Ligand binder design. Structure first.
Ligand SMILES: Nc1ncnc2c1ncn2[C@@H]1O[C@H](COP(=O)(O)O)[C@@H](O)[C@H]1O
Length: 127
């Protein structure tokens, strides 16, 4: 059967930010985000921390108080993790019940394989 593995964005192609970069570098990356959500991590995808809704960050950035790293991090949501090889069928449900919209595909070793989205699953199912 067709599985999550077939449609995920491969690990190498996941857009995220190393929260270790100097602040000006982090903001520059944030404002240049090619996607709606992006991964916050420390050093590499061996240490993914949270999923940040870019639109939310932008929104916070426009406000009166200085936008900070602390503010950014508390604005991100915990990552939703999907086992490797979960079938599209099963994931469709766990996402419907989840109302979550994005997941990181993960090994049994905790090793991120890719990124998957409900948009992605549906469009595949229907073609
Ligand atoms: N942070 C990301 N890194 C890599 N690919 C992504 C990311 N977010 C979304 N995508 C893919 O690009 C598609 C368009 O989403 P978006 O650009 O956020 O509207 C999604 O269905 C994902 O498959």
């Amino acid at each position: 059967k067709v599985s999550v593995n077939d449609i995920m964005v491969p690990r190498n192609e996941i857009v995220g930010i190393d929260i270790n970069d100097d602040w000006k570098s982090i903001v520059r990356q944030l404002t240049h985000s090619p996607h709606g959500r992006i991964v916050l991590y420390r050093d590499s995808l061996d240490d993914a921390i949270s999923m940040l809704r870019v639109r939310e960050a932008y929104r916070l950035m426009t406000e009166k108080k200085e936008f900070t790293k602390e503010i950014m991090l508390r604005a991100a949501d915990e990552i939703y993790f999907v086992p490797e090889g979960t079938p599209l069928s099963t994931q469709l449900v766990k996402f419907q019940r989840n109302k979550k919209k994005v997941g990181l595909v993960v090994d049994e070793y905790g090793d991120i394989q890719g990124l998957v989205t409900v948009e992605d699953i549906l469009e595949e199912i229907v073609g």
